[PDB]
Each structure stands twice: as structure tokens, then as C-alpha cells.
Amino acid sequence: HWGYGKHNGPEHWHKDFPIAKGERQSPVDIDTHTAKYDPSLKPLSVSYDQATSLRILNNGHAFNVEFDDSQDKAVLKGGPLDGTYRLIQFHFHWGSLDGQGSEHTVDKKKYAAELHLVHWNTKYGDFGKAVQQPDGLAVLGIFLKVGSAKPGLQKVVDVLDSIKTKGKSADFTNFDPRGLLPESLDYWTYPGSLTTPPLLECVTWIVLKEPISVSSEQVLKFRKLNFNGEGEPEELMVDNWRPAQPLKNRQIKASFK
């Protein structure tokens, strides 16, 4: 029964998931002056032209846009990664107010939201096996700020009324995740974890420097979702973000000077 409330939020997770106090937890603050440029890091290769989106699901903590990951259709490679990582789903974390919502921070700055494109390492065969490995996942994190609308987000925003409550799903085919990417693929990278229970330490994080802009109307639609099921007391799905965790024995690397 973990969540984001006063009685079950991030400060309680360690009781059920002791790895919450582990050595490589996420998110973290990205101190830009202390990140080190690593000239040997390769450009990212984001290959989403053949992506097959299938469905959108309200899982009670976020909404996931799910993809067919039974072939190499939408893959992430390069950068810090060895091998090929398949896109399984993306989701967001967002705030009740524009001044909070992101999980990672940049020099302590919080963005309005954060997009996570979740990929798993094909050498492990399936997602459930991948999360048990220290190099199992690669998550592309993209910050959202409020300003101009993001046209490529609109199809997502418009279906949210159909998945208001926990356990609702809707068909969501032919969505192109390339419309959620900023111009630049400059990034920071570090080893970390899932940011929701089970908090497994299986993620190579790749956090883009350049945020995307979304409109106030778009983020407001996020905030109309519900954490609860239909016919349960309504609680708005907002502030579904875990705060920054200690960096411990990790160095954040930058792909750019």
C-alpha cells in the first residue's frame, strides 16, 4: 500500500522496500558544476521510427503508455550503454503546482514534471529478468517546463479522460514517442534505481539537459487524473514524485561541456 500520501509516501517506503536506503537510489540532484564531462561517452542513439504503442493504463501511481517490446522496434543504444535496450513504456511524474513535480533536480531546481522512457536490456530476454540485473534498464529522463504547448503530447492528454481512475486502460495505437523529445540529446548519466517500489537498483539513468515545454492546459489535464479506483473516494493524482536521494559513492557524468 505504498503511494505518495502522508501515511504511505516516500519516507515510508523503506519499511516494505529496505533497498530504499540503498547505495544507488534514484532520483538524485544533478549538481551541474560537479558533474564531469566524459569525452569518451557516445551520442545516444534513439531509434523510435518503428515503435508500436499499444495501450495507456492508469496504474494508480501514474499512467503508462505501453509498447510492443517483443521485437527491436523502438530501441535505445549508445551513450553509456552496452547493447540494445527496448522501449517498454513511458510515464510521467508531476506536481500539484508548476514549481514542483520532477524527480531529478538540476542544481536543486525542480521542473513541473518529468518524463521517463523505460527500456530493458535485450540480453536478459524480458523486463522481469532485466530488473534483477545491475545493467538491466536504461531510463531516458526528460524534464517538462510549462510554457508553449507540446503538440506531440496532445494525443496523450486527450485520452486521459478515458483512464481517470486506477485500473482503467484504453487502446493507444500509433503514438509516436519522437514527438516528446527535445532538440538536443545532450545528457547526464549515472547508475541508479527505479523511483517507485520495488526501487530495484537496475537502471542506467540518462537525463537530458534540455527540457521540453508543455502548456498550462496540458499539465492541468494530468492533474485531473485520480489515484483511486472508480467508486472510491476521489484523490487527485498529483505530486507523484520521489524526492532526490543521497548520491553516495557515485559520480554523475556529462556528455557535453
Instruction: Give the residues lining the site for Zn ion (CB under 5 A).
Output: 116
Is 195 part of any known ligand binding site? yes
Tell me if 60 sits within 8 A of 236, measured CB to CB.
Answer: no
Q: Among 7, 12, 33, 61, which one carries the catalytic annotation?
A: 61
Provide, rounded to whole angstroms, the least separation between the CB of residue 8 and Zn ion.
18
Determine the residue with CB nearest Zn ion: 116
Is 91 part of any known ligand binding site? yes
Provide, rounded to whole angstroms, the least separation between the CB of residue 39 and Zn ion.
29
Provide, rounded to whole angstroms, the least separation between the CB of residue 240 and Zn ion.
9
Is 116 part of any known ligand binding site? yes
Is 33 part of any known ligand binding site? no
Q: Is 104 a catalytic residue?
A: no
Q: In sequence order, which residues have a C-beta less than 8 Å from that of residue 2 and are 6 or more positions away? A: 8, 12, 13, 16, 17, 196, 197
What is the C-alpha separation between 59 and 64, in angstroms, rounded? Answer: 7
What is the C-alpha separation between 146 and 113, in angstroms, rounded? Answer: 9
DSSP 41: P
Provide, rounded to whole angstroms, the least separation between the CB of residue 122 and Zn ion.
21
Q: Where are the beta strands (DSSP E) in 135-242?
A: 137-146, 169-171, 187-192, 203-208, 212-214
Q: Where are the beta strands (DSSP E) in 21-180?
A: 29-30, 36-37, 44-47, 53-58, 63-67, 75-78, 85-94, 105-106, 113-121, 137-146, 169-171
| Pick 116 or 221: Cβ nearer Zn ion | 116
| Pick 91 or 221: Cβ nearer Zn ion | 91
| Pick 177 or 256: Cβ nearer Zn ion | 177
Looking up cell 529478468 gives 129
Distances (CA, A) of 35 to 29, 30, 32, 250: 11, 7, 5, 10
Is 1 part of any known ligand binding site? no
Which residues are known binding-site members for substrate?
A: 195-196
Which residues are known binding-site members for Zn(2+)?
A: 91, 93, 116
Q: Which are the catalytic amino acids?
A: 61
